[PDB]
Design a protein around this nucleic acid. Sequence first.
DNA 1: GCGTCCCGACGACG
DNA 2: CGTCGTCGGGGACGC
Length: 279
Amino acid sequence: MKYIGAHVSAAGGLANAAIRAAEIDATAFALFTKNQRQWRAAPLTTQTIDEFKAACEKYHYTSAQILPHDSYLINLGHPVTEALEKSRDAFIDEMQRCEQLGLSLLNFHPGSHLMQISEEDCLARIAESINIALDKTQGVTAVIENTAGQGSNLGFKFEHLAAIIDGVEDKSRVGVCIDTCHAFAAGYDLRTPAECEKTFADFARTVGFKYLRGMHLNDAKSTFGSRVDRHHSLGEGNIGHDAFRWIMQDDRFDGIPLILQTINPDIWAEEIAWLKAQQ
DNA sequence: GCGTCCCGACGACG
DNA sequence: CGTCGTCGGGGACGC
Ligand SMILES: [Zn+2]
Ligand SMILES: [Zn+2]
Ligand SMILES: [Zn+2]
């Protein structure tokens, strides 16, 4: 069993997301529990929480099929203590918000040294940031997403994820989410079944599939090793459809939210359908 | 320096 | 009432 969806919109309320997900026949969906470009959001009201749950229950979307993503503003590895504290508070908020909504996963970006600390220093801060949050919450698993490696942003090498995990105490609540566009941009080839098997065997060796808690199926507008984060619709980009079919036929990707973040939402229904047809 | 990439609340419009 | 535009304000790309 595979859960295929997209990062649908939460405009007008979290329940709408589940509704939007159902409208395109998704068996999985991602969302923002609050605007990802602002520091503060009004606390969830029991009304919003209830409606969201009613919506999810109506369509049978279980916690294992939902992959909320945190704020863009958060840097769990910020070189400046004050800004790091702020990022930490926010991240804690996002995780507490997931607990209220009965969501067990939280997709977030690793962090950036902003040319002001070393890589180790930045990674250890991320580890610390996670321990701190898993310490102030329950039931929510921190899912680290690999990145394209733009600017001073870490997490483009599988080794960064493995190092961040080594520093986490409660390994039961830490995981990873692989974004095809990001891995490709980082330098992990996927343009053929052969490369996919190779790129994922590597992932298996340095991180291990027991930590995979989600996927981001994006094609790339950016190029191999460009370390540029620019997505594209499935098959219209530099990666191609082969990789996505390959993924759909590999059982190592079962029981997790496979989320589309392709550039044209209007064709998400077709993309979701095509992906399913690949199994 | 500015438009655009990795959006949801809400006020102004019509 | 539906829809659009602006604000918010981290880190970046590429011109
Ligand atoms: Zn992401
Ligand atoms: Zn992604
Ligand atoms: Zn991306």
